[PDB]
Design a protein around this ligand. Sequence first.
Ligand SMILES: [Ca+2]
Length: 223
Amino acid sequence: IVGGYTCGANTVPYQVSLNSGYHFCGGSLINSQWVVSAAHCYKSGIQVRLGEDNINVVEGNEQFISASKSIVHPSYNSNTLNNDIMLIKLKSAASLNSRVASISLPTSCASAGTQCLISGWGNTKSSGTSYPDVLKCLKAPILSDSSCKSAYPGQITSNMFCAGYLEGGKDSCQGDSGGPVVCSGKLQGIVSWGSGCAQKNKPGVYTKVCNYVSWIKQTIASN
Ligand SMILES: [Ca+2]
């Protein structure tokens, strides 16, 4: 997250870190046994880390649970990042409390102008690299489809939305991928891609979760 703020420990209780010996992507806990993340974060041998703030220090609220199954969206296209969404089933159910909690799926799509919370442990610089140990947060609006399509001609599908600031300065970044975009208490987006980070006229692009709720529910019900 570039241009954000320190969230505070366990203030984003649905945020997960995906770990394969190191943090590599975010995710969101959607019930006691399932995480949603980005398909481009797919790896074998994922450990899901819940209740994290500082990802390098054991602080006392963590739960570390191995993945039993990962399901990339059937139509994920790694070249265009269309359908950049994946489900991860945990080996055992998480213990839910005030600091580890699921986030609700949306029952509508969020409009342009809605304010959302984006979070992650990704890079905090637009030039160079500095990775934080504690969770960072950013409040950002959903942009109109027309501004989004004007920013990224020929690249935005119906399964994507833009959020952030056309002026630049404030954005998600490398290492935030897979993480949540939460608006009005619902999961509306997944950190997916962008051109650089926090660059002028290059807002973040997010997987539009409301298009996937049927697939998510059906998949969870049968796996
Ligand atoms: Ca920790």
